[PDB]
Amino acid sequence: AWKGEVLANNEAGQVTSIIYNPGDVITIVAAGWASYGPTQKWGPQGDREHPDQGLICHDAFCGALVMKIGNSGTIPVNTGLFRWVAPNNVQGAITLIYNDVPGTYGNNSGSFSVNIGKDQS
Amino acid sequence: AWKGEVLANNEAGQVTSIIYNPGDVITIVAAGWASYGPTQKWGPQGDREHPDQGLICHDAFCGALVMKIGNSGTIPVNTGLFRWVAPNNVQGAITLIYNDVPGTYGNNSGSFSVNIGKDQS
Amino acid sequence: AWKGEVLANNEAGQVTSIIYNPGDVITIVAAGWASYGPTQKWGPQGDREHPDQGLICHDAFCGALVMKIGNSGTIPVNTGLFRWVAPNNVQGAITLIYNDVPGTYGNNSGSFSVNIGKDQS
Amino acid sequence: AWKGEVLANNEAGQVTSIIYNPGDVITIVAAGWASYGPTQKWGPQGDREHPDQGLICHDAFCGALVMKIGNSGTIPVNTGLFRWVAPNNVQGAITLIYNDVPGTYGNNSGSFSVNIGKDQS
Ligand SMILES: OC[C@H]1O[C@@H](Oc2ccccc2)[C@H](O)[C@@H](O)[C@H]1O
Ligand SMILES: OC[C@H]1O[C@@H](Oc2ccccc2)[C@H](O)[C@@H](O)[C@H]1O
Ligand SMILES: OC[C@H]1O[C@@H](Oc2ccccc2)[C@H](O)[C@@H](O)[C@H]1O
Ligand SMILES: OC[C@H]1O[C@@H](Oc2ccccc2)[C@H](O)[C@@H](O)[C@H]1O
Ligand SMILES: [Ca+2]
Ligand SMILES: [Ca+2]
Ligand SMILES: [Ca+2]
Ligand SMILES: [Ca+2]
């Protein structure tokens, strides 16, 4: 299992010790407060009112927690995933990333505390 | 395992099929948007800016997801609990509740979708 | 989870720390060598050649590992149970017992090492 | 998870759908009756009285259930493994094999029914 912090201004994202393999079932739980710029902070679901201006993940709100698995595209994580299986041909190290527009992570603040574990299969 | 919705205006809370027994390890993941009154909506961590005016759970923000286990006091759930063990002498059916002041649930809106499962022990 | 030894000459059986509750999924793995009398020893499946002369469990061979859950009748365990769910209205402490005829445990020898854990549910 | 039969006369062994990956925790439960030649049959622990005459696994009795993981040497399985982690650098498909001397599987009989699952990690 892995636990650690995902910083909102970390554009490269946070690499974890979790390698997703074919057939794996995982659970993620994310908590905390972060901002993509404004003084206000939002949870792992991000800001439902902010327009998408080039987010690294178009299937999640700005300020949401997302992930990449290996060299997959971004996958929404939000508050977490419950006993979750990946799409086919998706595998590799899990990296957690704050959802923001590339080149605009500089003014971000806060972080998400995240737990990841593999479940029974 | 249990999955279902928890309505923000449900003052009595949502009873689940999960009976927490001594020694049990559980995982909860909660998602969605709700409000304790304002047009704005918040995630299961609630509104970090709103003052506590008599919340059923003083250890969580207004609009947060909380729970009771049997006849326990309220316990913060927020975005969820990862492989979580209860305090001693805590057991019984799990009821999920929106965190608001008693008597003020009438103007709430939205809901949280919640997964609960028992883990390896 | 529980791990411990189950002595073949223990007529009362070995009480474990495991309380089976409704809905629980459990895994048991048993290993080792024991005898109901003869110099030969058998594994947790017991002696397939020996006639049943009043075994505490008629659904298992003499010398097999069995269990009671609460005040249930004996249930065959043998080499173990994989992600196993009990019949309805069966619950309580798990006690492991060597399968022999009541009053004839005195000449038994050896033991089984057993692991019991609760599984994801 | 995987369930299936392992034939005693199958010298090449039974390939499973389980790929053991680094970090994986697995549970195996094996049951049934088989023989390496004699009319008598033995459980997954094999025959404790029979001398080793060139067994594919020298750390288990003749007639015992063993396995290979990828290109590993044979690993004793016996009645099963409980929440088990492999040695370092061991990974790949799990193949279950009856422990006998190479070239002598022809007169074997019976089979073991085996369950394999990945556990919480
Ligand atoms: O959409 C992503 C961008 O949102 C801006 O925040 C805004 C706040 C109000 C109006 C427009 C952008 C941030 O300042 C910028 O860094 C980037 O994150
Ligand atoms: O604190 C809990 C209460 O918050 C009020 O909303 C307010 C918003 C701003 C200032 C005071 C109350 C809600 O209108 C009321 O129903 C109750 O939930
Ligand atoms: O059936 C259970 C009994 O089996 C006897 O062993 C026998 C071995 C061969 C034939 C008859 C009894 C044991 O001596 C006795 O203690 C009891 O366990
Ligand atoms: O040790 C492995 C071998 O055991 C023999 O069975 C014997 C039984 C008693 C004495 C010698 C061999 C089998 O006949 C042969 O096929 C092979 O499995
Ligand atoms: Ca920004
Ligand atoms: Ca309200
Ligand atoms: Ca006896
Ligand atoms: Ca043979």
Q: Topology, pairings included?
A:
Four copies of one chain form a homotetramer.
Chain A: E1 2-7, E2 14-20, E3 26-35, E4 45-47, E5 62-69, E6 75-76, E7 80-84, E8 92-98, E9 109-118
Antiparallel strand pairs in A: 1-9, 2-8, 3-7, 3-9, 4-5, 5-6, 5-8
Bound molecules: phenyl beta-D-galactopyranoside (4 copies) and calcium ion (4 copies).
One phenyl beta-D-galactopyranoside (56N) binds at residues 36-38, 50, 53, 62, 100-101, 104, 107 of chain B.
Protein name (chains A, B, C, D): PA-I galactophilic lectin
InterPro entries (chains A, B, C, D): Galactose-bd-like_sf, PA-IL
Organism (chains A, B, C, D): Pseudomonas aeruginosa
How would you summarize what this structure contains?
Chains A, B, C, D: Pfam families: PA-IL (PF07828). The structure is a homotetramer of 121-residue chains. In chain A, 0% of the residues lie in helices and 48% in strands.
Would you write up a description of this structure?
Four copies of one chain form a homotetramer. Chain A is an all-beta fold. In chain A, the strands form two sheets. In chain A, strands 2, 4, 5, 6 and 8 form a five-stranded antiparallel β-sheet that branches. A four-stranded antiparallel β-sheet of chain A has the order 1-9-3-7, with no helix packed on it. The first copy, chain A, has strands spanning 2-7, 14-20, 26-35, 45-47, 62-69, 75-76, 80-84, 92-98, 109-118. In chain A, β5 (62-69) and β6 (75-76) form a beta hairpin. The first copy, chain A, has one domain (1-121): Galactose-binding lectin (Jelly Rolls). Chain A starts with a strand and ends with a strand. Chain A binds chain B through residues 1, 27-31, 33, 40-45, 48-49, 78-83, 115, 117, 120, and chain B through 1, 27-31, 33, 40-45, 48-49, 78-83, 115, 117, 120. Bound molecules: phenyl beta-D-galactopyranoside (4 copies) and calcium ion (CA) (4 copies). Residues 36-38, 50, 53, 62, 100-101, 104, 107 of chain D line the site of one phenyl beta-D-galactopyranoside. It is classed as sugar binding protein. Keywords: Lectin, Pseudomonas, Multivalency, Antimicrobial, Biofilm, sugar binding protein. The assembly is tetrameric. The entry is titled "Multivalency Effects in Glycopeptide Dendrimer Inhibitors of Pseudomonas aeruginosa Biofilms Targeting Lectin LecA". Chains A, B, C, D: LecA.
